[PDB]
Design an enzyme around this catalytic site. Sequence first.
Site, PDB file in Angstrom:
ATOM      1  N   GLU A   1       4.460   5.277   3.873  1.00  0.00           N
ATOM      2  CA  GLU A   1       3.811   6.543   4.213  1.00  0.00           C
ATOM      3  C   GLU A   1       4.844   7.552   4.723  1.00  0.00           C
ATOM      4  OE1 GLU A   1       0.478   7.959   3.929  1.00  0.00           O
ATOM      5  OE2 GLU A   1       1.948   9.512   4.363  1.00  0.00           O
TER       6      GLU A   1
ATOM      7  N   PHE B   1     -16.092   9.664   3.100  1.00  0.00           N
ATOM      8  CA  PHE B   1     -16.310  10.416   1.859  1.00  0.00           C
ATOM      9  C   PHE B   1     -17.385   9.735   1.008  1.00  0.00           C
ATOM     10  CE2 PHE B   1     -12.453  11.989   3.502  1.00  0.00           C
ATOM     11  CZ  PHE B   1     -11.461  11.005   3.501  1.00  0.00           C
TER      12      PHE B   1
ATOM     13  N   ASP C   1      -3.156  12.422  -2.821  1.00  0.00           N
ATOM     14  CA  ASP C   1      -3.415  13.868  -2.896  1.00  0.00           C
ATOM     15  C   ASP C   1      -4.032  14.232  -4.254  1.00  0.00           C
ATOM     16  OD1 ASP C   1      -3.388  16.733  -2.831  1.00  0.00           O
ATOM     17  OD2 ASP C   1      -1.505  16.773  -1.684  1.00  0.00           O
TER      18      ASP C   1
ATOM     19  N   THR D   1     -15.420   4.477   3.330  1.00  0.00           N
ATOM     20  CA  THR D   1     -14.907   5.669   4.034  1.00  0.00           C
ATOM     21  C   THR D   1     -16.007   6.699   4.330  1.00  0.00           C
ATOM     22  OG1 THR D   1     -14.311   7.029   2.088  1.00  0.00           O
ATOM     23  CG2 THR D   1     -12.659   5.410   2.841  1.00  0.00           C
TER      24      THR D   1
ATOM     25  N   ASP E   1      10.063   8.266   0.548  1.00  0.00           N
ATOM     26  CA  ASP E   1       9.432   8.524  -0.736  1.00  0.00           C
ATOM     27  C   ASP E   1       9.174   7.201  -1.460  1.00  0.00           C
ATOM     28  OD1 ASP E   1       8.791  10.455  -3.096  1.00  0.00           O
ATOM     29  OD2 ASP E   1      10.249   9.052  -3.930  1.00  0.00           O
TER      30      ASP E   1
ATOM     31  N   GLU F   1       0.829  -1.209   0.000  1.00  0.00           N
ATOM     32  CA  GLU F   1       0.000   0.000   0.000  1.00  0.00           C
ATOM     33  C   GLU F   1       0.860   1.254   0.000  1.00  0.00           C
ATOM     34  OE1 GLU F   1      -3.099   0.702   3.041  1.00  0.00           O
ATOM     35  OE2 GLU F   1      -3.677   2.540   1.964  1.00  0.00           O
TER      36      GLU F   1
ATOM     37  N   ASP G   1     -11.824  10.123  -4.300  1.00  0.00           N
ATOM     38  CA  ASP G   1     -13.130  10.767  -4.143  1.00  0.00           C
ATOM     39  C   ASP G   1     -13.267  12.048  -4.986  1.00  0.00           C
ATOM     40  OD1 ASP G   1     -11.261  12.033  -2.521  1.00  0.00           O
ATOM     41  OD2 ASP G   1     -12.585  12.235  -0.800  1.00  0.00           O
TER      42      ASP G   1
END
EC number: 2.1.1.33
Length: 208
Positions: free
Chosen positions: A60, A185, A110, A183, A87, A35, A146
């Site tokens: 992350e 959202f 993002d 989620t 990264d 992930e 989303d």
Amino acid sequence: EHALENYWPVMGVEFSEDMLDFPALFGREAPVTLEIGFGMGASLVAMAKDRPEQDFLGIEVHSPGVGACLASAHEEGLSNLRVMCHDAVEVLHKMIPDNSLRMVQLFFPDPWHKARHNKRRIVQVPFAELVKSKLQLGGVFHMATDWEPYAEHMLEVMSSIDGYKNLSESNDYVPRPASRPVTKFEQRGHRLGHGVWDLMFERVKLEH
């Protein structure tokens, strides 16, 4: 609490100029799922908890997210999860062997709403190509957003790459799989759509 401090030495993986050896890392030979940008790791922990027979790597860069994920993984007594704080692209280039991954997840990267920031969006052809090189044949790149303009951009990028086969039966988006949770959202079954777009593409042999 002091999760980074306490749990990083057990579950954390340091960045290295060298390729990871998954058998040595995970103590077994089992399918590996990555992930990218796991946030607080809620999805990753739920995933690892449900699949003790499989192994999981998370990346992350937001270190409080890394800490939250470690605390949760420890609480759930997971032995099949490792995490990185570096990264993701550098980790892909330097540390993930070609053809090694069963699945790559990218959930709510993002969205960079502004047109002037469009190139900051991580899903672009070179990135998606790099991800594909790390999947075993039959492996899947699963992304979610989303933000519909991002979803459309993701679809354009993915559709343009030989070796990716869209698992959408309508040649666009897929139903949310069990491998990603609902989620805030999200309004599942809403008359204007769920509000979240899932895309899943399988690595297939090159045609051209």
